[PDB]
Amino acid sequence: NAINPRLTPWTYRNTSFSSLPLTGENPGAWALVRDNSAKGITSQQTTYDPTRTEAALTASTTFALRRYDLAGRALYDLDFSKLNPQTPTRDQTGQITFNPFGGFGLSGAAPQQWNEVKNKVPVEVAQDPSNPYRFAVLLVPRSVVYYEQLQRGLGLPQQRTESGSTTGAMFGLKVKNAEADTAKSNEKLQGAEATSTQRGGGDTKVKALKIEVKKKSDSGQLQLEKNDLANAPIKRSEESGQSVQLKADDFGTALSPTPWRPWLATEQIHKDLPKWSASILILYDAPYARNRTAIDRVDHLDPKAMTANYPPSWRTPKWNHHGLWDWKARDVLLQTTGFFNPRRHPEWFDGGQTVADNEKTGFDVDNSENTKQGFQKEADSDKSAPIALPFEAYFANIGNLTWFGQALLVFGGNGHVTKSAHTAPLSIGVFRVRYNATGTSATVTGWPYALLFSGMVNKQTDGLKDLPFNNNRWFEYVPRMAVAGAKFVGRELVLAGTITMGDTATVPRLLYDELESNLNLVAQGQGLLREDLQLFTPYGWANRPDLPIGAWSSSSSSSHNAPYYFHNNPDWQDRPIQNVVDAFIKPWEDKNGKDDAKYIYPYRYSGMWAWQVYNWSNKLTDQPLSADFVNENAYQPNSLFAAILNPELLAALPDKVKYGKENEFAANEYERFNQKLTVAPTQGTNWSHFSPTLSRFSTGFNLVGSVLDQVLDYVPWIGNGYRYGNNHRGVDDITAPRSFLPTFSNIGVGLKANVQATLNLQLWTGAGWRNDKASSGQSDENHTKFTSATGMDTSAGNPDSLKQDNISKSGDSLTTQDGNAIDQQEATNYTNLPPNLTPTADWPNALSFTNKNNAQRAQLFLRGLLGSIPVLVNRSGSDSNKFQATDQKWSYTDLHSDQTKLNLPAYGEVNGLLNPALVETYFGNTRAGGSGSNTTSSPGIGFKIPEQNNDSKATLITPGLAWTPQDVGNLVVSGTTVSFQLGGWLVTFTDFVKPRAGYLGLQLTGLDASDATQRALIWAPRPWAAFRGSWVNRLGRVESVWDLKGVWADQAQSDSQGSTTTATRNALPEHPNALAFQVSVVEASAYKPNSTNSSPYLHLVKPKKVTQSDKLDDDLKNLLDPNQVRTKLRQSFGTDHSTQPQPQSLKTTTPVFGTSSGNLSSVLSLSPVEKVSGWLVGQLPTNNLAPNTNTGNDVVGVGRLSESNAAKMNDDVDGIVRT
C-alpha cells in the first residue's frame, strides 16, 4: 500500500508550504498529505488539557508525506507513525553507502529516540544542494496544527464604567489626572545655578534647573546620599479611597473573566522535548532503488537554545537605561514601564497577563527612603518576569528551512499558526542546525533578530531615511518579523517580509493634569489600544517628554513650570541665534558631566510630531548602536521589509553568544547617572561579531519621503478601487488660488508658499493654512505673525501665560520686553511663523512646524496596502445622523472665504493625512451626491465641524477589512527580483538586488474590487485562510492561488446580523482589526477665529474634559465593531447576482511590466516632488466601486488585476503539487 488514498494534500499556514519541486538527478516532488476529514480538537468555551488533547489527536488523525516523479505520478507515502526506518551505513570516508540500483546500506537499527518523535507531523521539506539524495524534514506536534480550534482569546481589564463610574472611558481604561502631594512639596527641583519672570525667576534671574545625584563614601553600596531623580511631588490620584493603579488582577484571577496565558510555558516544552518540541530529521530518498528509505538522525529545536542567547537586559523588561525617574514618570501618567512591558507584549511571557502590570521590576521602586529606591534586588521572592519563548511565540518562530553548506537555517514564519484575534505572535530570531562533514552529529542554536540586525545604518538603504530601526547596547529594540522566506538570488541571500519598528506613537508625553482630555493617547500608553499609528492630539503634550517629575509642578505655586515644563506650542519657541544660545544655554552646557550634576536650561523647546520623532525616537543614523531613546516596541509589524545577508557568516557565527557587562542595566542609581551611550566590547565577548550580517535593506520604493506621498495618492484603496489621491488634478486643480483633495500630498492644495519665514523654494501649504493677510486685505502674506499666533482671547494660543523677551547685544541683560527691534533687536522668539501646523504640515525648512515624517509614511504605506487606516467620524450615518453631501466643500473659491467647510478636525485623527480626504476615499459622499443613481448610496458616515452649541463627540473607526500585517505569503524569485503576497497585494522588489537608479523600485498588483469574486475575497471575514501559495510560471510571471470555499461557507452564514454587544457590554468583538478606541470631545468654540488672521486653524484645537455625560451615543458606539461598518459598506455595495457555481478557487497573475514601467528618468531629467506628481497625474485616468478600466496601468507599475489575468477555477484546492 504505497499510495494511501485516505490522505489528501494540505498547506501549512505558517509558511504557505504545500510542496517542493525537484529537478536534476532526483526529479519529482514532495507534497504534504493528511486525513482532511478529521475533526481535530473538540459561547460555552471550555478548557482543554494539553496531554489529553495531544493524545486524542494522535489517536484520531494521520499525517504523511507523498513522493512524486517527473511525470506527476504518486510513487509512495511516508507515514512516520507506521514507518520502521533504519539508519544507513557509511564507508571509511563517512560517505553514505549508496548505489543507483541497491539503494542505501541499512544497519538494522532505528534512530535514537525515534519511538518518541514518530507521532509528530511533517510540515516542511528542503533538499540539500550538495546531495540530491539528502533531505531535511521538519516535525511539529499535532496539537500545533489544530491550535486554531482552541480559540483562546485575549481579555480586557474589568471596568466599573461602560460610558455608552465616570470619566467616559471605555473597554476598561483607567484614566485619572494626577494631583500634587502636599507632603512631598519640598521635593521640587529648584533652579539653582546662574552666571525676568519668564525664566528661573530668586528674583528675575536666569536660572537653570539643577539635577544632582551623589553618593556617600560611608556604609548595592555608596548609599546614594542624594537622588534628585527620585523626587515625586506629583503622585497618582486616589479614587474611591484606594489609589488608581495598573494591576495584573485587572484581567481576572487565574483559575467570570479569566486572563490570557500561554498553553505551555517554555519550561514544560523544555522538559517534554520529545512530545512538545519541534524536530528536524534527515531523510535519504531514492525513488528507483531497492532500499529507498533511510532516516539518519533527529534533532530538536529546543526553545531554551534561543532563550539562552537573549540579551541580559531582557531578563527585566520593565526597566530601561533611564532608571527610576522614567519609571515614576511613566507610572504617574498611567503608562507601562520599561522597553518590553508584558501588558503590551504578553505573547512572550510564561505568566501571560497574570504579570501585565508595572510592579516587580527587579529593582526597588517603593522603598520608604528616597535614597534606597532604584537599587537592583537580589531577593528572589521579588523576581521579575523575563522575556521567554512560550508555546505560541515558539511555534510562530518555526518554518522556512534553508541550506548553506553544513548549516540549516530556520528563519520563521508569519505566525498564523498560533495567532488569535487580538494577539500577534512573531518570529524573534533564527535557529541554526550545523552538521559535521560526515553528517554524524549536529548542534542546535538560535539568535534573536535584535542581535543580527544590530549594525544598521542609513547608507544601507535606498528609500526613506531616519526610520526607527536603531538600537543601543542594551538591545531595547526588539525587532520581530513576519517572515516571507529566505532565498538565494544568485549568490545573495535575500530575506523579506514585514517587521516591527520602534514605537513612535507614544513618544510625546502628556501633561500630568491633561489625561482626562486625551483618552486615546492614554489608552495607547496603557497597552490597551493596540495601535501603532501616531494620533494627532498635540494640545495636551508637554513641550518635551524627557523631564523628571521634580521639574513638573512649579516654584511659585503657579501652573506648569515654564520655561521648563509647559504646554507644547512651537509658536512660543526660542530661536537659535548666537546671543540667545549664549544667554540660555552656555552658562551651564559645560558643566553637565561635571561633579555629578546635570542641568535643564531655561530654553523654550517645542515642536510638532516630526520634532518629537527626530529627538526621542530610535531613528537611523550613520553610527551603529547610537540610539539614545528607544521609547517602546510596536504591537504589530508596521513596515514592509527586505534584507540582504552575508550567508558565509551565518554558517560561521558562534554557537553561543557571550554578552558582556556593557549590555546590562546599572546596579545602582549613581552608576547610570554617569553613563555612556557607547562602550567598546569587552575581551572574551563576541556579541559584536553578529553586526556585519546585514549589507543592505529595503522598505519598499527608492523614493525620498515627499516623493513617496504622490505614489501613495496614486495607490487605490483595495476596498473599492478608488485611489487615495481622490483624482485631485495635480497642480492644475481648482483647490488653489468626481475630484476632491488628496490624502497624502500637498502639491496643489492650499496656497503657493515661497517661504523664508524661519530657520528660494516653491512649495505649498496644504489644507489648514493660517496665513496673515497683507496690507490691502486681499493680498496674502507668506507667513503667520507671532502677534497673531499668540493671543489671550485658557486661550489656545497662550495657555500658560508666557511673555516676550529680548537680549541686548553683549550677551547681557534680559528680563522683559515687547521686543523692540533697534538695540535690543534680537528677540528670543520668532517673528514670521510657517502658515500651517495642521496634520498636513510639511516644511522642509522648519523642523519644529512639520508633522509628516518617514516613520509615519512607512506605516501609512503598509496600512494603506492592508486597507485599514483609521478615520475620525462623528456622524453615525444612520437615520437622523447622516453626513449629507452638501456638508462638505472643496473648491478653493469657497475655502478661501471659509475654511471650516473642509471639515478638517485638526484634533483626534491620524497624523500625516487629510481626514476629509480619507472619508471621501472610504465612503465617497462627494461622488455619491452627483447623480440620482443609487440615491446617495454612501452610508453617510463622516466628520462635520460642530455648530453653535453642539460638541463634537467623535471616535476612530476602521472601514471593516480583515487583512492584518501578518498576512505574508511565501517568497518567490524571478530573474533578479523578489516578490511575495502581502494581504491582497502582490509586491515585487525590482531594484533591490541590482538597483537600477532612476526607477521607482517597486511594482504592485492587487485584487480588483470591481470583479465579483475578487470583491468577495477582499471583504471576507477571514481572507488569509484562503491563500494557497505563489509560484513563478515559465514566462517569468508570478501567480497566486486562492481557495474560496471557506469564503462561501462564511457568506452562507450571517453571525453579526444584529450584534449590539459592543455598545452594551464594552467588550472587544472578535474581529482582527477591532481596536479599543476612545472618544474625543471638542466644543464648537474651538473652531471659531479670533486680529489680522481669520483662520480657524490659527491656534491648536483645545479638547474638552471627558465626563460621564461626554460619552458617545449608542448608534456611534455601535461602529466600534468593524463588522457593523462592513455591513453598512457592503450594503452600500448592495447587489445580488451570485455566480452559480460561485467558483471554488481563483488564480491571479501579475501583468507584463515593460522596460519603461516605473521609470523616473523620463521626468527627473520644478522640484522633483512636483515633477513626479505631475508625471503621475498625466498618467492618471459616481459609483461605490471604481471600475478597473486598466488606464491606471503599466506605466508606473501601480495597477490592479485585469479580468484576463485572474483565472477562476471550479474545484477547491488545499495543497498544490508542483514538479
Side-chain angles (χ1 to χ4, degrees), residues 225 250 266 279 328 409 439 471 480 493 553 607 695 703 779 833 858 861 960 992 1043 1045 1094 1103 1145 1162 1195 1199:
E225 192 176 350
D250 285 327
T266 319
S279 302
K328 290 187 170 192
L409 306 165
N471 214 326
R480 295 143 296 156
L493 181 55
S553 174
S695 64
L703 301 177
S779 193
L833 315 173
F861 176 63
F992 176 49
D1043 177 15
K1045 66 107 174 299
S1094 176
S1145 30
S1162 60
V1195 191

Short mmCIF file of all heavy atoms in Angstrom, two decimals, residues 225 250 266 279 328 409 439 471 480 493 553 607 695 703 779 833 858 861 960 992 1043 1045 1094 1103 1145 1162 1195 1199:
data_model
loop_
_atom_site.label_atom_id
_atom_site.label_comp_id
_atom_site.label_asym_id
_atom_site.label_seq_id
_atom_site.Cartn_x
_atom_site.Cartn_y
_atom_site.Cartn_z
N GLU A 225 23.53 59.24 48.89
CA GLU A 225 23.19 60.32 49.82
C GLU A 225 22.10 61.25 49.31
O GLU A 225 21.33 61.78 50.12
CB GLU A 225 24.43 61.15 50.17
CG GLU A 225 24.21 62.09 51.35
CD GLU A 225 25.46 62.84 51.77
OE1 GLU A 225 26.56 62.51 51.28
OE2 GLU A 225 25.33 63.77 52.60
N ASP A 250 -6.43 43.11 37.06
CA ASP A 250 -7.46 43.79 36.28
C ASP A 250 -8.12 42.85 35.28
O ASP A 250 -9.24 43.09 34.85
CB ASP A 250 -6.86 44.98 35.54
CG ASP A 250 -6.58 46.16 36.44
OD1 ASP A 250 -7.34 46.36 37.42
OD2 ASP A 250 -5.60 46.89 36.18
N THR A 266 7.72 27.87 28.53
CA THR A 266 9.00 27.43 27.98
C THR A 266 9.51 26.21 28.75
O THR A 266 10.12 25.31 28.17
CB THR A 266 10.00 28.57 28.06
OG1 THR A 266 9.36 29.80 27.70
CG2 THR A 266 11.17 28.33 27.13
N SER A 279 11.09 19.10 15.75
CA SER A 279 12.27 18.32 15.44
C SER A 279 12.59 18.38 13.95
O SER A 279 11.70 18.45 13.10
CB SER A 279 12.10 16.87 15.87
OG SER A 279 11.83 16.78 17.25
N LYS A 328 8.98 56.30 37.44
CA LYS A 328 7.97 57.07 38.14
C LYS A 328 7.21 58.00 37.20
O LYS A 328 6.00 58.20 37.34
CB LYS A 328 8.60 57.86 39.28
CG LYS A 328 9.09 56.99 40.42
CD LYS A 328 9.56 57.82 41.59
CE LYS A 328 9.81 56.95 42.81
NZ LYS A 328 10.00 57.76 44.04
N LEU A 409 19.32 26.63 8.20
CA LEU A 409 18.77 27.81 8.86
C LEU A 409 17.26 27.72 8.95
O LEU A 409 16.60 27.17 8.07
CB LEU A 409 19.17 29.07 8.10
CG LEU A 409 20.66 29.26 7.84
CD1 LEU A 409 20.86 30.32 6.78
CD2 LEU A 409 21.40 29.65 9.11
N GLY A 439 28.20 14.24 8.59
CA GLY A 439 26.79 14.25 8.90
C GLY A 439 26.38 13.34 10.03
O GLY A 439 25.24 12.86 10.05
N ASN A 471 19.34 50.80 17.49
CA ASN A 471 19.36 50.04 18.72
C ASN A 471 20.47 50.62 19.59
O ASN A 471 21.22 51.50 19.16
CB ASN A 471 19.56 48.55 18.42
CG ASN A 471 18.84 47.66 19.39
OD1 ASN A 471 18.71 47.99 20.57
ND2 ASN A 471 18.35 46.53 18.91
N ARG A 480 10.89 42.04 15.78
CA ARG A 480 10.22 40.78 15.49
C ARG A 480 9.70 40.86 14.07
O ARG A 480 9.39 41.95 13.58
CB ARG A 480 9.10 40.51 16.47
CG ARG A 480 9.58 40.29 17.89
CD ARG A 480 8.61 40.89 18.87
NE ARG A 480 8.55 42.34 18.72
CZ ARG A 480 7.52 43.09 19.09
NH1 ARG A 480 6.45 42.53 19.61
NH2 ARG A 480 7.56 44.39 18.91
N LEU A 493 21.83 36.09 -0.40
CA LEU A 493 20.74 35.60 0.44
C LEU A 493 19.80 36.76 0.74
O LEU A 493 20.19 37.72 1.41
CB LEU A 493 21.29 34.99 1.73
CG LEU A 493 20.27 34.41 2.70
CD1 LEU A 493 19.40 33.37 2.00
CD2 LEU A 493 20.96 33.80 3.90
N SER A 553 5.93 70.68 38.49
CA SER A 553 4.83 71.48 39.01
C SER A 553 5.05 72.99 38.95
O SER A 553 4.50 73.65 38.06
CB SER A 553 4.55 71.07 40.45
OG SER A 553 3.58 71.92 41.03
N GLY A 607 7.79 71.71 19.51
CA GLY A 607 7.75 71.25 18.13
C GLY A 607 6.61 70.29 17.93
O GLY A 607 6.02 69.78 18.89
N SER A 695 24.05 43.71 4.94
CA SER A 695 24.76 44.55 3.99
C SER A 695 23.87 45.57 3.30
O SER A 695 24.34 46.64 2.92
CB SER A 695 25.45 43.68 2.93
OG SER A 695 24.49 42.98 2.16
N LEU A 703 12.39 56.01 -2.92
CA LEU A 703 11.94 57.39 -3.03
C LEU A 703 12.27 58.19 -1.77
O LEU A 703 12.33 57.65 -0.66
CB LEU A 703 10.44 57.43 -3.29
CG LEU A 703 9.98 56.71 -4.55
CD1 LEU A 703 8.47 56.74 -4.67
CD2 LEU A 703 10.64 57.31 -5.76
N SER A 779 -4.46 90.73 -0.65
CA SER A 779 -3.20 90.04 -0.87
C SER A 779 -2.84 89.25 0.38
O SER A 779 -3.09 89.70 1.49
CB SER A 779 -2.08 91.02 -1.22
OG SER A 779 -0.96 90.34 -1.73
N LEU A 833 6.17 82.99 11.41
CA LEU A 833 5.99 81.57 11.60
C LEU A 833 5.42 80.94 10.34
O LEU A 833 4.77 81.62 9.54
CB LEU A 833 5.05 81.31 12.78
CG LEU A 833 5.31 82.14 14.04
CD1 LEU A 833 4.20 81.92 15.04
CD2 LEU A 833 6.66 81.83 14.65
N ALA A 858 6.06 55.21 6.34
CA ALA A 858 6.18 53.77 6.18
C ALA A 858 4.95 53.04 6.72
O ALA A 858 4.41 52.14 6.07
CB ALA A 858 7.44 53.27 6.87
N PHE A 861 2.02 53.62 4.41
CA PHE A 861 2.12 52.78 3.22
C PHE A 861 1.66 51.36 3.52
O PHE A 861 0.84 50.79 2.78
CB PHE A 861 3.56 52.80 2.70
CG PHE A 861 3.78 51.89 1.54
CD1 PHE A 861 3.13 52.11 0.34
CD2 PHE A 861 4.65 50.82 1.63
CE1 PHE A 861 3.33 51.28 -0.74
CE2 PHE A 861 4.86 49.99 0.56
CZ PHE A 861 4.20 50.22 -0.63
N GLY A 960 -13.42 48.15 7.97
CA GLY A 960 -14.00 46.83 8.15
C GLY A 960 -13.25 45.68 7.53
O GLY A 960 -13.63 44.53 7.76
N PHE A 992 16.26 45.99 -5.85
CA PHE A 992 16.92 45.79 -4.56
C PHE A 992 18.19 44.97 -4.71
O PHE A 992 19.17 45.22 -4.00
CB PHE A 992 15.95 45.14 -3.57
CG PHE A 992 16.57 44.80 -2.25
CD1 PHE A 992 17.31 45.73 -1.56
CD2 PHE A 992 16.39 43.55 -1.69
CE1 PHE A 992 17.88 45.42 -0.35
CE2 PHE A 992 16.95 43.24 -0.48
CZ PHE A 992 17.69 44.18 0.19
N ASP A 1043 -8.17 29.64 -2.32
CA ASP A 1043 -9.23 28.65 -2.13
C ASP A 1043 -10.45 29.32 -1.51
O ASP A 1043 -10.51 29.52 -0.29
CB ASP A 1043 -8.76 27.51 -1.23
CG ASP A 1043 -9.85 26.49 -0.95
OD1 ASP A 1043 -10.87 26.49 -1.66
OD2 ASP A 1043 -9.69 25.68 -0.01
N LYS A 1045 -13.54 28.45 -0.95
CA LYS A 1045 -14.69 27.70 -0.46
C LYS A 1045 -15.06 28.10 0.97
O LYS A 1045 -16.24 28.12 1.33
CB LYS A 1045 -14.41 26.20 -0.56
CG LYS A 1045 -13.31 25.68 0.34
CD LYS A 1045 -13.87 24.89 1.51
CE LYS A 1045 -12.77 24.26 2.34
NZ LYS A 1045 -11.97 23.30 1.53
N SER A 1094 -8.08 85.49 10.16
CA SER A 1094 -9.41 84.90 10.30
C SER A 1094 -9.39 83.40 10.02
O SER A 1094 -10.32 82.87 9.40
CB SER A 1094 -10.40 85.61 9.38
OG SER A 1094 -11.67 84.98 9.43
N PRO A 1103 -9.11 70.42 23.40
CA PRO A 1103 -10.21 69.48 23.66
C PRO A 1103 -10.89 69.78 24.98
O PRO A 1103 -10.47 70.62 25.77
CB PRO A 1103 -9.50 68.13 23.69
CG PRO A 1103 -8.14 68.46 24.19
CD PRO A 1103 -7.80 69.82 23.66
N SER A 1145 -12.25 28.36 -6.41
CA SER A 1145 -10.87 28.79 -6.32
C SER A 1145 -10.57 29.74 -7.46
O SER A 1145 -11.18 29.67 -8.53
CB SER A 1145 -9.91 27.59 -6.34
OG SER A 1145 -10.45 26.52 -7.09
N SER A 1162 12.58 59.64 -17.16
CA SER A 1162 11.86 60.39 -18.18
C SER A 1162 11.30 61.70 -17.65
O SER A 1162 11.03 62.61 -18.44
CB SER A 1162 10.73 59.54 -18.76
OG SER A 1162 9.81 59.16 -17.75
N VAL A 1195 2.58 51.85 -16.68
CA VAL A 1195 3.48 52.96 -16.95
C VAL A 1195 4.17 53.33 -15.65
O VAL A 1195 5.26 53.92 -15.64
CB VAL A 1195 2.74 54.17 -17.56
CG1 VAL A 1195 3.74 55.19 -18.09
CG2 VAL A 1195 1.79 53.73 -18.66
N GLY A 1199 -0.94 49.10 -10.42
CA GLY A 1199 -2.16 48.74 -11.11
C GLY A 1199 -2.73 47.48 -10.50
O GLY A 1199 -2.06 46.77 -9.74
#
